[PDB]
Scaffold this active site. Structure first.
Site, PDB file in Angstrom:
ATOM      1  CB  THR C 139      16.266  31.022 -23.796  1.00 47.32           C
ATOM      2  OG1 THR C 139      17.254  30.058 -23.976  1.00 47.32           O
ATOM      3  CG2 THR C 139      15.056  30.736 -22.880  1.00 47.32           C
ATOM      4  CG  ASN C 200      23.262  44.026 -32.971  1.00 43.04           C
ATOM      5  OD1 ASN C 200      22.615  44.799 -32.160  1.00 43.04           O
ATOM      6  ND2 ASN C 200      22.886  42.702 -33.087  1.00 43.04           N
ATOM      7  CD  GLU C 248      -2.519  59.310 -28.452  1.00 47.87           C
ATOM      8  OE1 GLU C 248      -1.564  59.562 -29.014  1.00 47.87           O
ATOM      9  OE2 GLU C 248      -2.996  60.158 -27.716  1.00 47.87           O
TER      10      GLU C 248
HETATM   11  N1  LIG Z   1      23.162  41.062 -24.647  1.00 50.42           N
HETATM   12  C1  LIG Z   1      23.128  41.506 -25.594  1.00 50.42           C
HETATM   13  N2  LIG Z   1      22.595  40.913 -26.927  1.00 50.42           N
HETATM   14  C2  LIG Z   1      22.466  41.311 -27.973  1.00 50.42           C
HETATM   15  C3  LIG Z   1      22.740  42.495 -28.145  1.00 50.42           C
HETATM   16  N3  LIG Z   1      22.622  43.044 -29.459  1.00 50.42           N
HETATM   17  C4  LIG Z   1      22.158  42.038 -30.167  1.00 50.42           C
HETATM   18  N4  LIG Z   1      21.981  40.808 -29.078  1.00 50.42           N
HETATM   19  C5  LIG Z   1      21.690  39.536 -29.520  1.00 50.42           C
HETATM   20  O1  LIG Z   1      21.318  38.896 -28.508  1.00 50.42           O
HETATM   21  C6  LIG Z   1      21.404  37.650 -28.428  1.00 50.42           C
HETATM   22  C7  LIG Z   1      21.437  37.173 -27.006  1.00 50.42           C
HETATM   23  O2  LIG Z   1      20.938  35.846 -26.637  1.00 50.42           O
HETATM   24  P1  LIG Z   1      21.870  34.593 -26.417  1.00 50.42           P
HETATM   25  O3  LIG Z   1      23.079  34.687 -27.343  1.00 50.42           O
HETATM   26  O4  LIG Z   1      21.287  33.154 -27.015  1.00 50.42           O
HETATM   27  O5  LIG Z   1      22.310  34.446 -24.992  1.00 50.42           O
HETATM   28  P2  LIG Z   1      21.396  33.482 -24.082  1.00 50.42           P
HETATM   29  O6  LIG Z   1      21.618  33.882 -22.469  1.00 50.42           O
HETATM   30  O7  LIG Z   1      21.588  32.306 -24.339  1.00 50.42           O
HETATM   31  O8  LIG Z   1      20.038  34.019 -24.557  1.00 50.42           O
HETATM   32  P3  LIG Z   1      18.905  33.034 -24.411  1.00 50.42           P
HETATM   33  O9  LIG Z   1      18.872  32.433 -25.754  1.00 50.42           O
HETATM   34  O10 LIG Z   1      17.524  34.080 -24.358  1.00 50.42           O
HETATM   35  O11 LIG Z   1      19.058  32.397 -23.284  1.00 50.42           O
HETATM   36  C8  LIG Z   1      22.542  37.250 -29.274  1.00 50.42           C
HETATM   37  O12 LIG Z   1      22.600  36.492 -30.419  1.00 50.42           O
HETATM   38  C9  LIG Z   1      22.802  38.591 -30.136  1.00 50.42           C
HETATM   39  O13 LIG Z   1      22.802  38.377 -31.397  1.00 50.42           O
HETATM   40  C10 LIG Z   1      23.099  43.358 -27.121  1.00 50.42           C
HETATM   41  O14 LIG Z   1      23.309  44.579 -27.216  1.00 50.42           O
HETATM   42  N5  LIG Z   1      23.352  42.871 -25.631  1.00 50.42           N
END
Ligand SMILES: Nc1nc2c(ncn2[C@@H]2O[C@H](COP(=O)(O)OP(=O)(O)OP(=O)(O)O)[C@@H](O)[C@H]2O)c(=O)[nH]1
Ligand SMILES: Nc1nc2c(ncn2[C@@H]2O[C@H](COP(=O)(O)OP(=O)(O)OP(=O)(O)O)[C@@H](O)[C@H]2O)c(=O)[nH]1
Ligand SMILES: Nc1nc2c(ncn2[C@@H]2O[C@H](COP(=O)(O)OP(=O)(O)O)[C@@H](O)[C@H]2O)c(=O)[nH]1
Ligand SMILES: Nc1nc2c(ncn2[C@@H]2O[C@H](COP(=O)(O)OP(=O)(O)O)[C@@H](O)[C@H]2O)c(=O)[nH]1
Lengths: 428, 434, 434, 428
Positions: C139, C200, C248
Site C-alpha cells: 500500500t 536493506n 538546489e
Molecule cells: N517498517 C519498516 N519497513 C521496512 C523497513 N525496511 C524495509 N522495509 C520494507 O517496508 C515494507 C513494509 O510495507 P508492508 O510490508 O507491506 O507492511 P504494510 O503495513 O502492509 O505496508 P503497506 O503495504 O504500505 O500497507 C516491507 O516489505 C519491507 O520490505 C524498515 O526499516 N521498517
C-alpha cells in the site's frame, strides 16, 4: 392529569389483571397492601394515571373486573392481592354465559349492564381528565367477547372525544378453544372496528411459541403467558407514566399509525432471553433491534415477510441515545426497504423513556403495522363461512334474539377490511 | 434598556431554553437559584430585577404537557422562574396542528397573552421578542405559529426572530413531520421577520466527528444551539468594538421580505484533546466555517452561491486578521458569486470571550465566530419536503385528523402553493443576468 | 518561512519517521511530549506552533492497518502528533497494488487530501513536500504512487522529493516485490521531481562491519536513513556557511527530467570502539565515501562513471580541506569520467554538528558528510528487476489478483516498456563521443 | 477491525475447538470463566478478532459449533469450559449422519441449514468488518465433510469479497477410518476448490508420526493430537492478533502463495522437542530452520523431496532478527536450489512477530507449497476409482438423491487439479 380507567371482561380477560396490576405497582414501587414503598422520586409525577388517590396512602387501582360467572372471580379475590381492588367495582353475575356471543353480548349482559354504567360514570367524573379506557378481553369466548362490546358501544355513545383503546387475544390457527370461536371472533370485530379505534391481536399459540422458541421452557403455564404479554400494557404506558426525554401518548400513538380509520398492528418485546442465556450477551440497542425484527418476537400468527410495514413506533426505556437507534434503524430499513410502505418515507416513530425495568439495563416495546393482518381474517373468513354453509350451531344464536342475516353482515364487515389490505399489500 | 424577551413553546422549546438560560446564568455570574454572584448595564440585561437581588429570566414557557415543564421545578433551577410565567397545559393532543392551533391550544392563549403583556410593561427599551419552537413538535409548531400571528398583529413593527428546528433529511422523530410541520411555514412566513433553522442529524454529524462522542444526547445538541443564541443576543449586552444590534440582522440579510432563511455556522467546536496540539487562530476558524464539517444544516451550501452573510466574533479579535481572512474567501473558488451585492458581508466585533460550560465535553477557546449565511441552495430541504409532502397528500392520509380537529383542506391546497413560490423565489434570485 | 511537510505512507513510512522525528526532536531541544526544552528561525522550522508552546510535527501518517500506527499512541510519543493528522485505515488488503491503488486505498484519499490542505494553509513559505514509502510495501507502494499523482496534479511546480527503499538483490521481504513494486515507478516517474532509494541488505552489510553488531534490527536501519534526511532538510534550517536549499538539488542533479535516481553515501558511520584509536578528518571521510564500504545501495558504482554529485557537510569544516580532498578524487583512477560536466560537483556547508542519539551503538563525531551521487551504473538493480519481473510475467502469476482488484494487464504491458527506456537512458548517457 | 467468525463441523471437527479456544484465550490471557486476566498491555489492540465484546468482561468466543449428532456435542458442554460459548450458537441435530456424504451434505443438513444461516448472518453484520471465515472439519466423515460444504457454498454465495479459509484433515494412507472415506474425500474436494480459496491437509497418521518420531511418546491420544495442530491456527494468526514489526494477514498470505486459483500447501512447527530433550539444545533460528525443512516436521503424508517448493512463507514470533533468518534461508536455499521452483526467484516470505509463546523463547510456523500434493490425490484417485468399478456402496448415495454421474464429475475435478501439478513438477 391524563388518566385511564380500566375495564376487563371474561375469565382470562380477568386473569390478565394480576400480570398487569402487580407489575404496574412494581413499576411504580407499590406493594400488595397498597401503601407506598418506592425508592426514587422519579415514580410519582405521573402516578395518578392508573390509580385513584386514597385516605392513608391506599392508592386504589382504578379498575372494574367484570365477568358473567363467579368461577374465576373469587380466585383472585380469595387468593393474594385481595386488598388491592375495591369490591364495589367487583361485579359478576351467577348464571353461566356458555361462551355464546349473543347470550353474552345481547341478553345476559343486559341483566348486568345497568349495574355496569353507574359504576364507570361515577368513576369517570371523579377523574380529573380522562385519557382513555382500556378493554382487555377475549375474541374467542362469550363473556369477554360479547359483554364488553355492548359495554363498549354505550361508552363510545357517551364519550365521543375520549379515546377507546382495546387489547384482545386471537383465535388460534391450530390450538383453538371452542368451535364457536369462529363466530365469536367475527362478531367481536363487528363492534371493535365500528366503535373503538385500536385493537391488538395476540395468539396464545404464537405466545406458546415464544417460550418454546426463545426462552426454552417445555412447559410454561398461563401465569407465565400473561406475565410476558403484561409488560406491553406496561410498555405502551412506559413512555407515559414517568418522565423521559421525548415521549408521546397513546392518542399520539393513534394518529401517527394509520392513514385511515382502520387500526390493527403488532406487539413485541425487547430484550428477551432464557435462564442461562442471560449473561452471555451484550444487551444494547443492536441487541434490541434484532429482537424487533423477526416474526419470532412478534405476537400475531402472521408473517410480516408476507406483509409490509405501514408505520413503526418504537418505545425504549433505559439509558439510550438516538444515534444508536438511528444508525441501527437505518441499518435494517435499507436491507428491508421493500418491506416498508412507499406511501410514506420514514414511517418510523422514535420515543425514548428514562428508567429501566427490573434487573434489565434497557427495554424496548414494539409497534409495527402490517398489511398481512388480513392473514388473520382470511384464515378467519373461510373458517367462518364454512361453518355457515350448513348453518352450524345456528340455533344457539337465533334461539336467543338475533336475526341470521345480521350475522351475514359481519362477513362483509370482515371483507370490507380485507378489501383495503388487499390493495396496500401490492399497490401504489 | 435595549431589552427583549424569549418565548418557549414546544417540548424542544422547553429543553432548548434549559441550555440557553444555563448559558445566560453563567455569562453574568448568576447563581442557579437566581440569587446570583457567589458589565455596568450588563448586570441588568435579560432580567427585570427585584430589590431582593434575585431576578426573573425574562422568558415564558408554553407547553400542553405538564410532563417536561415540571422537571424544572424538580430540577436545580426551581427558584429561577416564577409560577405565573411558567404556564402549562393540563391536557394535550400534540402532533395535531389544527387542534393545537384551532381547538385545544387556543384555550391557553388568553392566559398566555396576558403574560406577554405585563412583561412588556417593564422592558422600556423593547427590541421585539424571541421565539423558540420546533417543526418536529405538533403544538410547538401548532401554538407557535398561532403565537406569532396575534403578536405581530398586536405589536406591528416589532422584531420577530425565531430559531427553529426541522425534521432531518434522514431521521424523523414522527411521521407527522411532513404534515404538521410544513404548513406552519404559512403563518410564520408573514409573521417572522427573520428566522433560523437547524438539523439534528447535521448537528449529530458534528458530534461524532468534532465532538467525537459515539452516544450523545439532546442536551449536548441543546448546548450547541444555545451558544448561537448568546452569540447574537448577549453581544449587544456587552460593550464590544463594533456593536451589532438585533435590528441590524433583519436589514442586513433580506433583499426581499420572503428570503429570510439564512444558515448557521458556529466554530470553533473542538473536542477536549483536539484543542491541545492545535492553535486555532481566527483565520483557522473562518477557513473552517466555510467548510461543511462545522455546518449546522444538512444541505449543500457549497453548490449554491452565497447571497449575504453577517459574521459575529467573540473574544480577542483584530479586524486586520478579518480582512486578511475574508479577502481569501472571496478569492477562493469554493464560493463563486453574489450578483446583487459586490461585498456581501457584515462584520461585527464583541470582546466577550466564549463561555465554556463545565459539564459537557466541549473545550475552551479564546476566540469565537458565528455565521449567518444566506445562499442559493437552502431551498433543497424545502424541496425535500415537497418531495415528501406532496406524496403524503397524494393519498389523503388522516385528512380526517386534520378535518375532525376543525379545519378543511383548503390550507393543504395552499400548502405546496406557498412552498412553490418559495422554490420560485430562489430561482428568481438564481436569475443573474442583465 | 521556508517550510515543508513530510508524508508517511506504508509500514516502512511509519517506522522511518519514528527515527526521523526522533532525530528532529533532538536537533532542536524538543521534549518527547512535544512540550519542549528541558536558532532564531530554528525554533519554528518544522513546526506550526501553538501558543501553548508544544508544537505539531508537520507530518501525516497513512496506513491501512491500525496495527503499527497505534503503537505510537502506546509508545512514548503519545502527545506529539494529533489525532486528525494521524489518519489510519480500518481494514487493509496490502501487498495488493491495484486495490490499494484502485479499490481500498482510494477511500482514504479524500480524507487524506483535506489534511494536506490545511497544513498547506499555514506554511507560508512552502518548498514542495516530502514523501516516504517503500517498494516492499504494497500500500505504501500502492497509495504512495497514487498520493503523488494528484498532489503534483494540484500543486504543479512544487517540489517532490522521496526517499524510497526497494527489495534487495538477495533478500526479499515478500514475493510481490517484483510485481507490486516495479510498476509504481510508472506513476512516480513523472510525479517525483527527484527520488532516492536505498537497500536493506546493503544497509545491513554496513551493520555487520561498520557497526559490528551481529543481530541488528529495523530500528537501527531506521536511524541510519534518518540522518540522511536531516543532512538535507535541517541544513537549510540552520545558518551555515554556504547554504543549500531543497530546490538546489533538483537543479543540480538532473541534466534530463528522467535521470533523477542518485546514490546515498553517508559517512562517517563509526562504531563505539572504532572512533577511539582513530582521527576521522574530513578527507579521511571523503576517501571513505567513495569506497564501497559505506555505500548505501548494493550496486557497483565503482564500475560505472559518476555523473554529478552534490555533497553536504556538517560541523567544523573548511573549504580548503574540501579542495585538497576533492582534487584527489578527480585525480584518482577510481573515478574515470564525466563527459557532460567537467566539474561534476556541488559543495555545501552547514555548521551544525552531527547529532548523536544515545540509545543505538553509533558513535559521536565532530564532522559529517552526506553524498548524493548520480552515476552510469545505478540501473543494474533496475536490470535486476528486469531479470526478475519479466520472468514472473512469463507465466502470468495472479494476474487475476491484479485483474480482480480492478485493472487490466495493459500497465503490465507498459511495465517493462517504461523500464526499457530507463535502461535506454543510461546507455544514452553512456554515449560519450563527438 | 479485521475480524473472523468461526465455523466447525463434525465430531472431531468440533473436538478441535478446545485445543483452539483454550490456547487462543491463553494466547490472549483469558481464563475459563471468560473474564479478563492478562499480564501485558500488548495483548489487547487486536483482541477483537476472535471475540465479540460482552457486558461485564465476558468476551464471548465468536463461534458456531455445528454437528448432526448429539453424541459429542454435550461432551464439551457438560465437561469443562461450559461457560465460554453461548448456547444460542450451539446447534446440533439428533438423527444420525451415518457419516455418509450426501446424507450429510444434501439432505439432513438441509433440515438444519435454515437454522444455520440465520445464526451467522446476525453474527456477521454485528461485526465491524469481517476478515474471513474458518471452516474446520474432516475430509473423511459425513457431517464435517458434507454439511459444512453446503454451508460453505451458501456463504460464498453471500459474501463474494470476504475470504473463505478452511482447515481440514486428510484420509490416511494406511490408518483410515471408514471405507467411504474415499468417497467423502473426493466429494469434499469438489466444493473446497470451487468455492473457498485455501485448504490445508493434515494426516492423522503423519501426525501420529510426530510424537512417534520427534517427541518420543509411544501412546498419545487425540487431546495431544489436536493440541499440537492447534497452534498453527494460532500460528497463522500469530502474525495478526498482536503487534510486531512487519506482519501481514491471511489474505496477504493468500495472494502471495499461488500463481493460479489452485490453493493447497503444507503446515509445520518450530521448535519442537521431547520431555528430556528440552534443555539440551540452543533454541534459535538455526534450530528453527532445520525443523522447517524435513518432511518429518510436516503434516502432509507426501514427500517434498518428491515435490518442489512453489512458494514459502515463514511466520516467526519471539526476539528474532532478519539476518539470522536471511543467512540461514540462504544457507538452505542453495543446497536445495533444485527443490525450488524456477518460475519464481525468491519465493520466500518473511514475517516477524513480537511476543513468544508460553515457556519458549522463539516460535515459527511453516508455510511451504508443493507440487507433490498430487501424491495425496493420486493416492486418492485410484483409491477412489477402484471403488467405482463395481459401484461400491453406491446405493447409500443414489438412495438419497444424487445422480451417479455427478459422482463421476468429481474424478475429473480431481484430475483437473493433478493435470496442472503434473506440469510444474517438471516443466518450465
Ligand atoms: N517498517 C519498516 N519497513 C521496512 C523497513 N525496511 C524495509 N522495509 C520494507 O517496508 C515494507 C513494509 O510495507 P508492508 O510490508 O507491506 O507492511 P504494510 O503495513 O502492509 O505496508 P503497506 O503495504 O504500505 O500497507 C516491507 O516489505 C519491507 O520490505 C524498515 O526499516 N521498517
Ligand atoms: N426537547 C427537545 N426536542 C428536540 C430536540 N431536538 C429536536 N427535537 C424535536 O422536537 C420535537 C419535540 O416536540 P414533540 O415531540 O411533539 O413533543 P411535544 O411535547 O408533543 O411537543 P409539542 O408538539 O409542541 O407539544 C421532536 O419532534 C424532535 O424532533 C431537543 O434537543 N430537545
Ligand atoms: N388472556 C388469556 N387468554 C386465554 C388464556 N388461555 C386461554 N385464553 C383464551 O381466553 C378465552 C378464555 O375463555 P373465557 O375467558 O371463558 O371467554 P369468556 O366467555 O369471554 O369469559 C378463550 O377464548 C381462550 O382461547 C390465557 O392464559 N390468557
Ligand atoms: N481433527 C481430528 N480428526 C480426527 C481425529 N480422529 C479421527 N479424526 C478424523 O475425523 C473424522 C471423525 O469423523 P466424524 O467427525 O464423525 O466425521 P463427521 O461425520 O463429519 O462428523 C474421521 O474422518 C477421522 O478420520 C482427531 O483426533 N482429530
Amino acid at each position: 392529569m391524563r388518566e385511564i380507567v380500566h375495564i376487563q371482561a371474561g375469565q382470562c380477560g380477568n386473569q390478565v389483571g394480576a400480570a398487569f396490576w402487580s407489575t404496574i405497582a412494581d413499576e411504580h414501587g407499590l406493594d400488595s397492601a397498597g401503601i407506598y414503598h418506592g425508592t426514587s422520586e422519579a415514580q410519582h409525577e405521573r402516578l395518578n394515571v392508573y390509580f385513584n388517590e386514597a385516605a392513608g396512602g391506599k392508592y386504589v387501582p382504578r379498575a372494574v373486573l367484570v365477568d358473567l360467572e363467579p368461577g374465576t372471580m373469587d380466585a383472585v379475590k380469595s387468593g393474594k392481592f385481595g386488598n388491592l381492588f375495591r369490591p364495589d367495582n367487583i361485579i359478576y353475575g351467577q348464571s353461566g354465559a356458555g361462551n355464546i356471543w349473543a347470550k353474552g353480548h345481547y341478553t345476559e349482559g343486559a341483566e348486568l349492564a345497568d349495574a355496569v354504567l353507574d359504576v364507570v360514570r361515577r368513576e369517570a367524573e371523579a377523574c380529573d381528565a380522562l385519557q382513555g379506557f382500556q378493554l382487555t378481553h377475549s375474541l374467542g369466548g362469550g363473556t369477554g367477547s360479547g359483554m364488553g362490546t355492548l359495554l363498549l358501544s354505550k361508552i363510545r355513545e357517551e364519550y365521543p372525544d375520549r379515546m377507546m383503546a382495546t387489547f384482545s387475544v386471537a383465535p388460534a390457527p391450530k390450538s383453538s378453544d371452542t368451535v364457536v370461536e369462529p363466530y365469536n371472533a367475527t362478531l367481536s370485530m363487528h363492534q371493535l372496528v365500528e366503535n373503538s379505534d385500536e385493537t391488538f391481536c395476540i395468539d396464545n399459540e404464537a405466545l406458546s411459541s415464544i417460550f418454546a422458541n426463545t426462552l426454552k421452557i417445555k412447559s410454561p403455564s398461563y401465569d407465565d403467558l400473561n406475565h410476558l404479554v403484561s409488560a406491553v400494557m406496561a410498555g405502551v404506558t412506559t413512555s407515559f407514566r414517568f418522565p423521559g426525554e421525548l415521549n408521546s401518548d397513546l392518542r399520539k400513538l393513534a394518529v401517527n399509525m394509520v392513514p385511515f380509520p382502520r387500526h390493527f398492528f403488532m406487539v413485541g418485546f425487547a430484550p428477551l432471553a432464557a435462564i442461562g442465556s442471560s449473561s452471555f450477551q451484550a444487551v444494547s440497542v443492536p441487541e434490541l433491534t434484532q429482537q424487533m425484527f423477526d416474526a419470532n418476537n412478534m405476537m400475531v400468527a402472521a408473517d410480516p415477510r408476507h406483509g409490509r410495514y405501514l408505520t413503526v413506533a418504537a418505545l425504549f426505556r433505559g439509558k439510550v441515545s438516538m444515534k444508536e437507534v438511528d444508525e441501527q434503524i437505518r441499518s435494517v430499513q435499507t436491507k428491508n426497504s421493500a418491506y416498508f410502505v412507499e406511501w410514506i418515507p420514514d414511517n418510523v416513530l422514535k420515543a425514548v423513556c428514562s428508567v429501566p425495568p427490573k434487573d434489565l439495563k434497557m427495554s424496548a416495546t414494539f409497534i409495527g403495522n402490517s398489511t398481512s393482518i388480513q392473514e388473520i381474517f382470511r384464515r378467519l373468513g373461510d373458517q367462518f363461512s364454512a361453518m355457515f354453509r350448513r348453518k352450524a350451531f345456528l340455533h344457539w344464536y337465533t334461539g336467543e334474539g338475533m336475526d341470521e342475516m345480521e350475522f351475514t353482515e359481519a362477513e362483509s364487515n370482515m371483507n370490507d377490511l380485507v378489501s383495503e389490505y388487499q390493495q396496500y399489500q401490492e399497490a401504489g | 434598556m435595549r431589552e427583549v424577551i424569549s418565548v418557549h413553546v414546544g417540548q424542544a422549546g422547553v429543553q432548548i431554553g434549559n441550555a440557553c438560560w444555563e448559558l445566560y446564568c453563567l455569562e453574568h455570574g448568576i447563581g442557579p437559584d437566581g440569587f446570583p454572584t457567589e458589565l455596568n448595564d450588563g448586570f441588568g440585561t435579560f432580567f427585570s430585577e427585584t430589590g431582593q437581588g434575585k431576578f426573573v429570566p425574562r422568558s415564558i414557557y408554553v407547553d400542553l404537557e405538564p410532563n417536561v415543564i415540571d422537571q424544572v421545578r424538580t430540577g436545580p433551577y426551581k427558584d429561577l422562574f416564577h409560577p405565573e410565567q411558567m404556564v402549562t397545559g393540563k391536557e394535550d393532543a400534540s402532533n395535531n396542528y389544527a387542534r393545537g392551533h384551532y381547538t385545544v391550544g387556543k384555550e391557553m392563549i388568553d392566559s398566555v397573552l396576558e403574560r406577554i403583556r405585563r412583561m412588556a410593561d417593564n422592558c422600556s427599551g423593547l427590541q421585539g421578542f424571541l421565539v423558540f419552537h420546533s417543526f418536529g413538535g405538533g403544538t410547538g409548531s401548532g401554538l407557535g405559529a398561532l403565537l406569532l400571528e396575534r403578536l405581530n398583529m398586536e405589536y406591528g413593527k416589532k422584531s420577530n426572530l425565531q430559531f427553529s428546528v426541522y425534521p432531518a433529511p434522514q431521521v424523523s422523530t414522527s411521521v407527522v413531520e411532513p404534515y404538521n410541520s410544513v404548513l406552519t411555514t404559512h403563518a410564520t412566513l408573514d409573521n417572522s421577520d427573520c428566522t433560523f433553522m437547524v438539523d439534528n442529524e447535521a448537528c449529530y454529524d458534528i458530534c461524532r466527528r468534532n465532538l467525537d462522542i459515539e452516544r450523545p444526547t439532546y442536551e449536548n445538541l441543546n448546548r450547541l444551539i444555545a451558544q448561537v443564541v448568546s452569540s447574537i443576543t448577549a453581544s449587544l449586552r456587552f460593550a464590544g468594538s463594533l456593536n451589532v444590534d438585533l435590528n441590524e440582522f433583519q436589514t442586513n440579510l433580506v433583499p426581499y421580505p420572503r428570503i429570510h432563511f439564512p444558515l448557521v455556522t458556529y466554530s470553533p467546536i473542538v473536542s477536549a484533546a483536539k484543542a491541545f496540539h492545535e492553535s486555532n487562530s481566527v483565520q483557522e476558524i473562518t477557513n473552517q466555517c466555510f467548510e461543511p464539517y462545522n455546518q449546522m444544516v444538512k444541505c449543500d451550501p457549497r453548490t449554491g452561491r452565497y447571497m449575504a452573510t453577517c459574521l459575529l466574533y467573540r473574544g480577542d479579535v483584530i479586524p486586520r486578521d478579518v480582512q486578511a481572512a475574508v479577502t481569501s474567501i472571496k478569492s477562493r473558488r469554493t464560493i463563486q458569486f453574489v450578483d446583487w451585492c459586490p461585498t456581501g458581508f457584515k462584520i461585527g466585533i464583541c470582546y466577550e470571550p466564549p463561555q465554556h460550560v463545565p459539564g459537557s465535553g466541549i473545550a475552551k477557546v479564546n476566540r469565537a465566530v458565528c455565521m449567518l449565511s444566506n445562499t442559493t441552495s437552502i431551498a433543497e430541504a424545502w424541496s425535500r419536503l415537497d418531495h415528501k409532502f406532496d406524496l403524503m397528500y397524494s393519498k389523503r392520509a388522516f385528512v380526517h385528523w386534520y378535518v375532525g380537529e376543525g379545519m378543511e383542506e383548503g390550507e393543504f391546497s395552499e400548502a405546496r402553493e406557498d412552498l412553490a413560490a418559495l422554490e420560485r423565489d430562489y430561482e428568481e434570485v438564481g436569475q443573474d443576468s442583465m
